Amino acid sequence: KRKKYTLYLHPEKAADFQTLEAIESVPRSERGELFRNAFISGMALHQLDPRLPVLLTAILSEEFSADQVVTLLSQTTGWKPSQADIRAVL
Amino acid sequence: KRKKYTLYLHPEKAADFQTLEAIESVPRSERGELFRNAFISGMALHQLDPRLPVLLTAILSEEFSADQVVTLLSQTTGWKPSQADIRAVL
């Protein structure tokens, strides 16, 4: 068994175009597994809050960073630091 | 140039199954735009660190949380809160 999914990107938009470059630097053999994981985590973000996947898409750029994902995660989810290095005791 | 991508999920697995349900509760009409966003942001995560999209897929459960994403993010990127601690201390 295995469900098949089809989707389309628009190479004119910067995010789409940038995604296309990231994919082509991944050997075809390894892509089916890449797509699955990208799609699952993408949909995971969606389950966290439906705006997230469209937000990450919209913000995507060469400056993309983990930070952008966290603050974006804060704004959408209310997520706030719960733990932190203990050295950071001021 | 509307590029097209084909990917496969595996209902037999928890993560894939949990993803199917998410898709299901989204009207067919909207799924096309939902798939692109989930895909692009999934690949955005890939660009941050290739292990990320497979770490999220792997951890995926009904307890998925922003907090889990931030964690995998730091364990995989080096991201850490900042003076954003002084805040939480309130």
Tab-separated table of N, CA and C in Angstrom:
chain	number	residue	atom	x	y	z
A	1	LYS	N	0.853	-1.226	0.000
A	1	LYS	CA	0.000	0.000	0.000
A	1	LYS	C	0.876	1.258	0.000
A	2	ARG	N	0.294	2.386	-0.405
A	2	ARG	CA	1.017	3.658	-0.464
A	2	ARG	C	0.113	4.687	-1.136
A	3	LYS	N	-0.152	5.811	-0.476
A	3	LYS	CA	-0.997	6.808	-1.109
A	3	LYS	C	-0.139	7.783	-1.897
A	4	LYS	N	-0.598	8.106	-3.100
A	4	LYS	CA	0.121	9.012	-3.976
A	4	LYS	C	-0.411	10.435	-3.879
A	5	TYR	N	0.503	11.396	-3.793
A	5	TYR	CA	0.132	12.799	-3.716
A	5	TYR	C	0.845	13.575	-4.788
A	6	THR	N	0.125	14.524	-5.379
A	6	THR	CA	0.671	15.368	-6.432
A	6	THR	C	0.516	16.835	-6.044
A	7	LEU	N	1.527	17.641	-6.349
A	7	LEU	CA	1.482	19.057	-6.020
A	7	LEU	C	2.298	19.845	-7.033
A	8	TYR	N	2.060	21.152	-7.112
A	8	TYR	CA	2.781	21.988	-8.067
A	8	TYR	C	3.432	23.236	-7.470
A	9	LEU	N	4.591	23.600	-8.010
A	9	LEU	CA	5.303	24.801	-7.593
A	9	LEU	C	5.277	25.775	-8.776
A	10	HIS	N	5.430	27.064	-8.489
A	10	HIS	CA	5.411	28.090	-9.523
A	10	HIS	C	6.764	28.774	-9.552
A	11	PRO	N	7.677	28.267	-10.388
A	11	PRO	CA	9.032	28.805	-10.527
A	11	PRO	C	9.193	30.310	-10.717
A	12	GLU	N	8.097	31.050	-10.862
A	12	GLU	CA	8.232	32.494	-11.017
A	12	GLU	C	8.401	33.172	-9.659
A	13	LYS	N	7.701	32.668	-8.644
A	13	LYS	CA	7.779	33.219	-7.291
A	13	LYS	C	9.116	32.840	-6.645
A	14	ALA	N	9.690	33.745	-5.860
A	14	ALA	CA	10.987	33.513	-5.218
A	14	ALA	C	11.103	32.288	-4.330
A	15	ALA	N	10.061	31.986	-3.560
A	15	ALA	CA	10.114	30.832	-2.669
A	15	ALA	C	10.129	29.591	-3.517
A	16	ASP	N	9.126	29.472	-4.381
A	16	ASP	CA	9.015	28.322	-5.266
A	16	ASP	C	10.328	28.118	-5.982
A	17	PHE	N	10.808	29.166	-6.632
A	17	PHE	CA	12.071	29.073	-7.338
A	17	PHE	C	13.205	28.611	-6.421
A	18	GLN	N	13.262	29.152	-5.214
A	18	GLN	CA	14.322	28.768	-4.302
A	18	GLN	C	14.204	27.308	-3.862
A	19	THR	N	12.970	26.831	-3.715
A	19	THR	CA	12.739	25.450	-3.319
A	19	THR	C	13.260	24.546	-4.423
A	20	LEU	N	12.977	24.938	-5.662
A	20	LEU	CA	13.403	24.193	-6.828
A	20	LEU	C	14.929	24.013	-6.850
A	21	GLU	N	15.675	25.043	-6.465
A	21	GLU	CA	17.125	24.933	-6.433
A	21	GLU	C	17.576	23.962	-5.351
A	22	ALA	N	16.920	24.008	-4.198
A	22	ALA	CA	17.301	23.135	-3.098
A	22	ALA	C	17.111	21.671	-3.469
A	23	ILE	N	16.016	21.390	-4.166
A	23	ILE	CA	15.681	20.044	-4.588
A	23	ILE	C	16.665	19.474	-5.609
A	24	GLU	N	17.028	20.278	-6.609
A	24	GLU	CA	17.930	19.791	-7.640
A	24	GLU	C	19.369	19.565	-7.194
A	25	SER	N	19.696	19.898	-5.955
A	25	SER	CA	21.047	19.650	-5.482
A	25	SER	C	20.981	18.406	-4.611
A	26	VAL	N	19.885	17.670	-4.764
A	26	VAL	CA	19.659	16.421	-4.045
A	26	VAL	C	19.490	15.358	-5.147
A	27	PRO	N	20.388	14.359	-5.184
A	27	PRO	CA	20.345	13.283	-6.184
A	27	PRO	C	18.988	12.595	-6.282
A	28	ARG	N	18.437	12.546	-7.492
A	28	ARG	CA	17.119	11.959	-7.737
A	28	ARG	C	16.796	10.725	-6.915
A	29	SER	N	17.767	9.830	-6.783
A	29	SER	CA	17.559	8.600	-6.027
A	29	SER	C	17.060	8.874	-4.615
A	30	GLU	N	17.613	9.913	-3.997
A	30	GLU	CA	17.266	10.274	-2.633
A	30	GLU	C	16.063	11.205	-2.499
A	31	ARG	N	15.464	11.613	-3.613
A	31	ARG	CA	14.337	12.549	-3.578
A	31	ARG	C	12.977	12.075	-3.112
A	32	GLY	N	12.632	10.826	-3.392
A	32	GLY	CA	11.334	10.324	-2.982
A	32	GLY	C	11.212	10.368	-1.478
A	33	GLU	N	12.313	10.068	-0.795
A	33	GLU	CA	12.315	10.075	0.656
A	33	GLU	C	12.356	11.518	1.167
A	34	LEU	N	13.003	12.384	0.397
A	34	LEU	CA	13.117	13.798	0.721
A	34	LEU	C	11.724	14.424	0.656
A	35	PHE	N	11.000	14.137	-0.422
A	35	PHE	CA	9.664	14.677	-0.611
A	35	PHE	C	8.739	14.227	0.508
A	36	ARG	N	8.754	12.936	0.808
A	36	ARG	CA	7.906	12.434	1.877
A	36	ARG	C	8.147	13.219	3.165
A	37	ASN	N	9.392	13.253	3.633
A	37	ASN	CA	9.727	13.977	4.858
A	37	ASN	C	9.360	15.466	4.827
A	38	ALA	N	9.577	16.111	3.684
A	38	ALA	CA	9.287	17.531	3.554
A	38	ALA	C	7.802	17.767	3.661
A	39	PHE	N	7.037	16.861	3.065
A	39	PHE	CA	5.588	16.953	3.059
A	39	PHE	C	5.014	16.676	4.449
A	40	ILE	N	5.522	15.643	5.119
A	40	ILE	CA	5.048	15.294	6.455
A	40	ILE	C	5.307	16.443	7.421
A	41	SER	N	6.555	16.900	7.496
A	41	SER	CA	6.878	17.987	8.418
A	41	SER	C	6.120	19.248	8.037
A	42	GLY	N	5.905	19.437	6.743
A	42	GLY	CA	5.152	20.592	6.292
A	42	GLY	C	3.764	20.510	6.900
A	43	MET	N	3.099	19.369	6.717
A	43	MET	CA	1.765	19.147	7.265
A	43	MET	C	1.766	19.117	8.793
A	44	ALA	N	2.914	18.844	9.395
A	44	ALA	CA	2.966	18.813	10.845
A	44	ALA	C	2.825	20.259	11.284
A	45	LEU	N	3.595	21.137	10.648
A	45	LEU	CA	3.537	22.553	10.953
A	45	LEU	C	2.085	23.015	10.817
A	46	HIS	N	1.421	22.604	9.744
A	46	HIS	CA	0.025	22.966	9.514
A	46	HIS	C	-0.869	22.569	10.678
A	47	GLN	N	-0.609	21.407	11.264
A	47	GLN	CA	-1.411	20.930	12.388
A	47	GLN	C	-1.171	21.791	13.613
A	48	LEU	N	0.010	22.388	13.689
A	48	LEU	CA	0.340	23.251	14.811
A	48	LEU	C	-0.516	24.508	14.698
A	49	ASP	N	-0.638	25.012	13.476
A	49	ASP	CA	-1.435	26.190	13.158
A	49	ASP	C	-1.383	26.344	11.646
A	50	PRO	N	-2.542	26.248	10.987
A	50	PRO	CA	-2.684	26.354	9.530
A	50	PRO	C	-1.980	27.522	8.841
A	51	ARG	N	-1.712	28.607	9.562
A	51	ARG	CA	-1.035	29.741	8.947
A	51	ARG	C	0.464	29.501	8.772
A	52	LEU	N	1.034	28.663	9.635
A	52	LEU	CA	2.467	28.392	9.596
A	52	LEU	C	3.032	27.990	8.247
A	53	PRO	N	2.503	26.919	7.639
A	53	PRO	CA	3.097	26.588	6.345
A	53	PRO	C	3.019	27.704	5.310
A	54	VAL	N	1.951	28.493	5.309
A	54	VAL	CA	1.894	29.578	4.328
A	54	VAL	C	2.829	30.720	4.754
A	55	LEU	N	3.016	30.884	6.061
A	55	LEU	CA	3.909	31.916	6.591
A	55	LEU	C	5.369	31.626	6.230
A	56	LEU	N	5.791	30.376	6.421
A	56	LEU	CA	7.158	30.003	6.098
A	56	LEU	C	7.358	30.144	4.605
A	57	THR	N	6.348	29.767	3.826
A	57	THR	CA	6.491	29.889	2.387
A	57	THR	C	6.675	31.353	2.045
A	58	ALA	N	5.761	32.185	2.520
A	58	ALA	CA	5.814	33.617	2.253
A	58	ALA	C	7.131	34.307	2.683
A	59	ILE	N	7.713	33.877	3.803
A	59	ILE	CA	8.940	34.508	4.289
A	59	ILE	C	10.233	33.957	3.697
A	60	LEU	N	10.160	32.746	3.140
A	60	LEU	CA	11.327	32.075	2.575
A	60	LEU	C	12.215	32.982	1.738
A	61	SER	N	13.511	32.927	2.003
A	61	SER	CA	14.474	33.729	1.272
A	61	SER	C	15.848	33.178	1.597
A	62	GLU	N	16.867	33.769	0.992
A	62	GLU	CA	18.230	33.329	1.211
A	62	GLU	C	18.672	33.622	2.635
A	63	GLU	N	17.886	34.417	3.349
A	63	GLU	CA	18.191	34.766	4.730
A	63	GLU	C	17.420	33.900	5.711
A	64	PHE	N	16.674	32.931	5.193
A	64	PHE	CA	15.900	32.046	6.051
A	64	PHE	C	16.792	31.535	7.173
A	65	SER	N	16.228	31.402	8.365
A	65	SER	CA	17.001	30.944	9.501
A	65	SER	C	16.114	30.295	10.543
A	66	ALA	N	16.730	29.539	11.448
A	66	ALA	CA	15.980	28.883	12.506
A	66	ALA	C	15.252	29.949	13.301
A	67	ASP	N	15.913	31.088	13.505
A	67	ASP	CA	15.317	32.176	14.268
A	67	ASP	C	13.992	32.603	13.655
A	68	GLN	N	13.993	32.865	12.350
A	68	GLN	CA	12.761	33.252	11.672
A	68	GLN	C	11.657	32.239	11.921
A	69	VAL	N	12.026	30.964	12.021
A	69	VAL	CA	11.038	29.920	12.255
A	69	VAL	C	10.519	29.949	13.684
A	70	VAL	N	11.355	30.347	14.632
A	70	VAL	CA	10.908	30.375	16.018
A	70	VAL	C	9.986	31.552	16.299
A	71	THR	N	10.392	32.736	15.861
A	71	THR	CA	9.562	33.891	16.123
A	71	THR	C	8.256	33.696	15.383
A	72	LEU	N	8.344	33.157	14.175
A	72	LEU	CA	7.151	32.912	13.382
A	72	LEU	C	6.299	31.898	14.139
A	73	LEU	N	6.977	31.045	14.897
A	73	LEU	CA	6.320	30.007	15.673
A	73	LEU	C	5.705	30.630	16.916
A	74	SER	N	6.322	31.701	17.404
A	74	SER	CA	5.798	32.399	18.575
A	74	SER	C	4.503	33.099	18.186
A	75	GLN	N	4.595	33.986	17.197
A	75	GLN	CA	3.461	34.758	16.697
A	75	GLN	C	2.221	33.924	16.409
A	76	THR	N	2.429	32.752	15.853
A	76	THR	CA	1.319	31.912	15.475
A	76	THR	C	0.800	30.981	16.572
A	77	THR	N	1.713	30.481	17.391
A	77	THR	CA	1.375	29.523	18.425
A	77	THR	C	1.375	30.055	19.848
A	78	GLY	N	2.062	31.166	20.068
A	78	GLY	CA	2.139	31.718	21.402
A	78	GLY	C	3.327	31.096	22.112
A	79	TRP	N	4.004	30.174	21.431
A	79	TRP	CA	5.157	29.500	22.003
A	79	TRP	C	6.103	30.495	22.630
A	80	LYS	N	6.605	30.116	23.796
A	80	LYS	CA	7.521	30.951	24.547
A	80	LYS	C	8.569	30.035	25.190
A	81	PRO	N	9.815	30.522	25.323
A	81	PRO	CA	10.882	29.720	25.929
A	81	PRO	C	10.442	29.132	27.267
A	82	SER	N	10.593	27.821	27.411
A	82	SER	CA	10.222	27.137	28.645
A	82	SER	C	11.474	26.721	29.420
A	83	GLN	N	12.532	26.391	28.684
A	83	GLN	CA	13.801	25.984	29.270
A	83	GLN	C	14.918	26.836	28.705
A	84	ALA	N	16.097	26.722	29.295
A	84	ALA	CA	17.243	27.476	28.820
A	84	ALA	C	18.494	27.075	29.578
A	85	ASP	N	19.642	27.300	28.947
A	85	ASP	CA	20.929	26.988	29.547
A	85	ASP	C	20.883	27.541	30.969
A	86	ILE	N	21.537	26.864	31.909
A	86	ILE	CA	21.521	27.328	33.288
A	86	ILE	C	22.522	28.460	33.516
A	87	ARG	N	23.518	28.572	32.636
A	87	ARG	CA	24.506	29.648	32.738
A	87	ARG	C	23.744	30.959	32.646
A	88	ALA	N	22.682	30.952	31.843
A	88	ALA	CA	21.847	32.129	31.655
A	88	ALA	C	21.035	32.427	32.910
A	89	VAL	N	21.719	32.415	34.049
A	89	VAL	CA	21.116	32.735	35.336
A	89	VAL	C	21.537	34.195	35.496
A	90	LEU	N	21.258	34.960	34.443
A	90	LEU	CA	21.601	36.372	34.352
A	90	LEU	C	23.106	36.435	34.132
B	1	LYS	N	5.722	28.168	-15.693
B	1	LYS	CA	6.381	26.852	-15.954
B	1	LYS	C	5.800	25.787	-15.025
B	2	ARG	N	4.865	26.210	-14.175
B	2	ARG	CA	4.194	25.337	-13.210
B	2	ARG	C	4.783	23.924	-13.123
B	3	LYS	N	5.786	23.748	-12.264
B	3	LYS	CA	6.441	22.455	-12.083
B	3	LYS	C	5.551	21.524	-11.268
B	4	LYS	N	5.703	20.222	-11.477
B	4	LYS	CA	4.888	19.244	-10.761
B	4	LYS	C	5.717	18.224	-9.990
B	5	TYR	N	5.260	17.875	-8.791
B	5	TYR	CA	5.961	16.899	-7.978
B	5	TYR	C	5.017	15.818	-7.473
B	6	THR	N	5.531	14.590	-7.436
B	6	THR	CA	4.773	13.430	-6.987
B	6	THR	C	5.452	12.807	-5.777
B	7	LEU	N	4.689	12.554	-4.719
B	7	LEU	CA	5.259	11.965	-3.513
B	7	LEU	C	4.324	10.901	-2.929
B	8	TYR	N	4.875	10.002	-2.114
B	8	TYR	CA	4.077	8.931	-1.522
B	8	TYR	C	4.151	8.821	-0.006
B	9	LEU	N	2.990	8.646	0.615
B	9	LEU	CA	2.906	8.462	2.055
B	9	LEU	C	2.664	6.966	2.290
B	10	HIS	N	2.866	6.511	3.524
B	10	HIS	CA	2.689	5.104	3.872
B	10	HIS	C	1.806	4.956	5.097
B	11	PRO	N	0.479	4.906	4.891
B	11	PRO	CA	-0.499	4.772	5.974
B	11	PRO	C	-0.103	3.802	7.087
B	12	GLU	N	0.626	2.743	6.736
B	12	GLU	CA	1.074	1.767	7.730
B	12	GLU	C	1.893	2.402	8.864
B	13	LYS	N	2.481	3.567	8.606
B	13	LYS	CA	3.277	4.249	9.621
B	13	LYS	C	2.459	5.296	10.373
B	14	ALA	N	2.776	5.492	11.647
B	14	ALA	CA	2.061	6.466	12.468
B	14	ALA	C	2.049	7.831	11.809
B	15	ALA	N	3.235	8.413	11.666
B	15	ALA	CA	3.379	9.730	11.066
B	15	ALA	C	2.584	9.871	9.781
B	16	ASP	N	2.797	8.973	8.824
B	16	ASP	CA	2.065	9.066	7.563
B	16	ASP	C	0.558	9.029	7.791
B	17	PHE	N	0.116	8.173	8.703
B	17	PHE	CA	-1.306	8.074	8.972
B	17	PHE	C	-1.836	9.352	9.597
B	18	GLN	N	-1.096	9.909	10.541
B	18	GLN	CA	-1.534	11.132	11.194
B	18	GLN	C	-1.621	12.267	10.167
B	19	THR	N	-0.789	12.185	9.127
B	19	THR	CA	-0.768	13.186	8.066
B	19	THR	C	-2.005	13.032	7.188
B	20	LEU	N	-2.383	11.785	6.903
B	20	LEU	CA	-3.568	11.497	6.091
B	20	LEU	C	-4.806	12.120	6.710
B	21	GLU	N	-4.959	11.953	8.015
B	21	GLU	CA	-6.111	12.513	8.692
B	21	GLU	C	-6.127	14.027	8.564
B	22	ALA	N	-4.969	14.655	8.712
B	22	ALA	CA	-4.894	16.100	8.589
B	22	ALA	C	-5.386	16.512	7.201
B	23	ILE	N	-4.892	15.835	6.168
B	23	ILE	CA	-5.298	16.134	4.799
B	23	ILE	C	-6.814	15.994	4.678
B	24	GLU	N	-7.317	14.828	5.084
B	24	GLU	CA	-8.743	14.517	5.021
B	24	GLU	C	-9.652	15.638	5.504
B	25	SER	N	-9.361	16.220	6.663
B	25	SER	CA	-10.205	17.290	7.192
B	25	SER	C	-9.941	18.659	6.566
B	26	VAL	N	-9.562	18.637	5.293
B	26	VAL	CA	-9.299	19.845	4.521
B	26	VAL	C	-9.955	19.587	3.170
B	27	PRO	N	-10.951	20.410	2.802
B	27	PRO	CA	-11.670	20.273	1.525
B	27	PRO	C	-10.787	20.177	0.277
B	28	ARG	N	-11.058	19.166	-0.546
B	28	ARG	CA	-10.306	18.901	-1.777
B	28	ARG	C	-9.832	20.161	-2.499
B	29	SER	N	-10.745	21.109	-2.681
B	29	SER	CA	-10.441	22.360	-3.368
B	29	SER	C	-9.215	23.078	-2.802
B	30	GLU	N	-9.134	23.146	-1.478
B	30	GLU	CA	-8.027	23.815	-0.806
B	30	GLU	C	-6.732	23.000	-0.718
B	31	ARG	N	-6.826	21.684	-0.873
B	31	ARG	CA	-5.651	20.821	-0.784
B	31	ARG	C	-4.517	21.145	-1.743
B	32	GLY	N	-4.836	21.675	-2.913
B	32	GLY	CA	-3.779	21.996	-3.851
B	32	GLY	C	-2.859	23.072	-3.308
B	33	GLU	N	-3.454	24.096	-2.711
B	33	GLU	CA	-2.686	25.198	-2.164
B	33	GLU	C	-2.065	24.807	-0.824
B	34	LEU	N	-2.682	23.839	-0.156
B	34	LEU	CA	-2.194	23.362	1.131
B	34	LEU	C	-0.946	22.496	0.912
B	35	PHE	N	-0.966	21.675	-0.133
B	35	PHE	CA	0.163	20.811	-0.458
B	35	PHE	C	1.417	21.605	-0.821
B	36	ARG	N	1.249	22.671	-1.591
B	36	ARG	CA	2.387	23.489	-1.999
B	36	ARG	C	3.062	24.139	-0.790
B	37	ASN	N	2.256	24.714	0.101
B	37	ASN	CA	2.771	25.361	1.303
B	37	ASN	C	3.461	24.359	2.231
B	38	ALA	N	2.824	23.214	2.432
B	38	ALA	CA	3.389	22.191	3.288
B	38	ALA	C	4.697	21.696	2.688
B	39	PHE	N	4.732	21.573	1.367
B	39	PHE	CA	5.928	21.113	0.670
B	39	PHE	C	7.058	22.155	0.775
B	40	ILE	N	6.789	23.382	0.320
B	40	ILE	CA	7.786	24.452	0.358
B	40	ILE	C	8.385	24.667	1.752
B	41	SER	N	7.532	24.758	2.768
B	41	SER	CA	8.030	24.955	4.122
B	41	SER	C	8.789	23.717	4.601
B	42	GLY	N	8.400	22.552	4.095
B	42	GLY	CA	9.087	21.325	4.464
B	42	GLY	C	10.511	21.402	3.936
B	43	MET	N	10.639	21.827	2.688
B	43	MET	CA	11.939	21.975	2.073
B	43	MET	C	12.679	23.150	2.702
B	44	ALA	N	11.949	24.126	3.238
B	44	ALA	CA	12.615	25.273	3.857
B	44	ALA	C	13.385	24.725	5.064
B	45	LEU	N	12.717	23.850	5.813
B	45	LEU	CA	13.316	23.205	6.966
B	45	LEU	C	14.551	22.418	6.509
B	46	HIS	N	14.441	21.727	5.375
B	46	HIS	CA	15.550	20.948	4.818
B	46	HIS	C	16.799	21.799	4.604
B	47	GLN	N	16.598	23.021	4.117
B	47	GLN	CA	17.698	23.944	3.837
B	47	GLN	C	18.387	24.422	5.109
B	48	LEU	N	17.653	24.411	6.212
B	48	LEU	CA	18.189	24.833	7.492
B	48	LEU	C	19.155	23.760	7.974
B	49	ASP	N	18.791	22.517	7.694
B	49	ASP	CA	19.573	21.343	8.052
B	49	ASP	C	18.793	20.176	7.485
B	50	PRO	N	19.437	19.350	6.660
B	50	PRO	CA	18.731	18.206	6.077
B	50	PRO	C	18.114	17.220	7.072
B	51	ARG	N	18.689	17.083	8.263
B	51	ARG	CA	18.134	16.148	9.243
B	51	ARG	C	16.762	16.571	9.772
B	52	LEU	N	16.509	17.884	9.807
B	52	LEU	CA	15.256	18.430	10.325
B	52	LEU	C	13.964	17.826	9.794
B	53	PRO	N	13.758	17.816	8.465
B	53	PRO	CA	12.496	17.222	8.018
B	53	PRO	C	12.335	15.735	8.320
B	54	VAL	N	13.421	15.004	8.542
B	54	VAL	CA	13.231	13.597	8.885
B	54	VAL	C	13.123	13.464	10.413
B	55	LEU	N	13.637	14.435	11.149
B	55	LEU	CA	13.509	14.406	12.604
B	55	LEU	C	12.043	14.703	12.972
B	56	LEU	N	11.440	15.670	12.282
B	56	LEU	CA	10.054	16.030	12.557
B	56	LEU	C	9.155	14.892	12.153
B	57	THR	N	9.420	14.291	11.001
B	57	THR	CA	8.570	13.190	10.573
B	57	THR	C	8.627	12.099	11.620
B	58	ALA	N	9.846	11.730	11.997
B	58	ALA	CA	10.079	10.687	12.979
B	58	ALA	C	9.404	10.941	14.339
B	59	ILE	N	9.511	12.155	14.864
B	59	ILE	CA	8.913	12.460	16.161
B	59	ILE	C	7.387	12.619	16.135
B	60	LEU	N	6.849	12.976	14.970
B	60	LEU	CA	5.415	13.207	14.786
B	60	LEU	C	4.458	12.266	15.521
B	61	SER	N	3.623	12.842	16.380
B	61	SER	CA	2.636	12.098	17.156
B	61	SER	C	1.524	13.080	17.494
B	62	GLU	N	0.470	12.608	18.147
B	62	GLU	CA	-0.632	13.492	18.509
B	62	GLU	C	-0.245	14.507	19.564
B	63	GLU	N	0.993	14.438	20.029
B	63	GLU	CA	1.470	15.355	21.052
B	63	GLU	C	2.371	16.399	20.430
B	64	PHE	N	2.486	16.369	19.107
B	64	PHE	CA	3.330	17.326	18.404
B	64	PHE	C	3.077	18.728	18.944
B	65	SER	N	4.139	19.497	19.150
B	65	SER	CA	4.000	20.841	19.694
B	65	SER	C	5.042	21.804	19.175
B	66	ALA	N	4.738	23.091	19.243
B	66	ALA	CA	5.691	24.086	18.785
B	66	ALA	C	6.997	23.805	19.512
B	67	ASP	N	6.871	23.499	20.800
B	67	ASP	CA	8.008	23.223	21.661
B	67	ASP	C	8.912	22.113	21.122
B	68	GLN	N	8.328	21.087	20.518
B	68	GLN	CA	9.147	20.016	19.968
B	68	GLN	C	9.917	20.532	18.761
B	69	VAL	N	9.276	21.384	17.967
B	69	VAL	CA	9.932	21.924	16.784
B	69	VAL	C	11.106	22.791	17.187
B	70	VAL	N	10.918	23.631	18.200
B	70	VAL	CA	12.002	24.507	18.635
B	70	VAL	C	13.186	23.678	19.117
B	71	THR	N	12.889	22.590	19.815
B	71	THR	CA	13.926	21.710	20.332
B	71	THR	C	14.739	21.065	19.212
B	72	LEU	N	14.068	20.342	18.324
B	72	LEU	CA	14.757	19.716	17.206
B	72	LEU	C	15.550	20.787	16.456
B	73	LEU	N	14.980	21.983	16.395
B	73	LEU	CA	15.606	23.101	15.716
B	73	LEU	C	16.959	23.476	16.312
B	74	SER	N	17.026	23.514	17.639
B	74	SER	CA	18.266	23.895	18.298
B	74	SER	C	19.267	22.755	18.307
B	75	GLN	N	18.776	21.537	18.515
B	75	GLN	CA	19.646	20.368	18.533
B	75	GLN	C	20.228	20.147	17.153
B	76	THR	N	19.683	20.842	16.175
B	76	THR	CA	20.094	20.646	14.806
B	76	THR	C	20.623	21.898	14.109
B	77	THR	N	20.495	23.044	14.759
B	77	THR	CA	20.911	24.308	14.169
B	77	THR	C	21.821	25.108	15.083
B	78	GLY	N	21.613	24.942	16.383
B	78	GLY	CA	22.403	25.656	17.357
B	78	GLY	C	21.593	26.782	17.955
B	79	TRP	N	20.368	26.962	17.465
B	79	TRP	CA	19.501	28.029	17.952
B	79	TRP	C	19.241	27.947	19.452
B	80	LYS	N	19.315	29.099	20.106
B	80	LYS	CA	19.073	29.201	21.540
B	80	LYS	C	18.419	30.536	21.865
B	81	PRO	N	17.606	30.565	22.923
B	81	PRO	CA	16.956	31.817	23.301
B	81	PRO	C	18.056	32.841	23.557
B	82	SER	N	17.688	34.110	23.655
B	82	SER	CA	18.669	35.167	23.885
B	82	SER	C	18.415	35.846	25.228
B	83	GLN	N	18.343	37.172	25.197
B	83	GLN	CA	18.054	37.944	26.394
B	83	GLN	C	16.552	37.800	26.591
B	84	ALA	N	15.946	37.011	25.703
B	84	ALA	CA	14.519	36.718	25.732
B	84	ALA	C	14.243	35.935	27.012
B	85	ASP	N	15.277	35.812	27.836
B	85	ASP	CA	15.180	35.121	29.110
B	85	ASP	C	14.709	36.098	30.170
B	86	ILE	N	15.294	37.296	30.166
B	86	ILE	CA	14.919	38.332	31.125
B	86	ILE	C	13.395	38.412	31.122
B	87	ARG	N	12.820	38.310	29.929
B	87	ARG	CA	11.376	38.348	29.768
B	87	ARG	C	10.709	37.216	30.535
B	88	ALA	N	10.939	35.987	30.079
B	88	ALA	CA	10.350	34.812	30.706
B	88	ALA	C	10.478	34.860	32.227
B	89	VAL	N	11.550	35.477	32.717
B	89	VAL	CA	11.781	35.588	34.155
B	89	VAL	C	10.689	36.434	34.819
B	90	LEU	N	9.750	36.931	34.025
B	90	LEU	CA	8.670	37.745	34.569
B	90	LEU	C	7.344	36.992	34.466
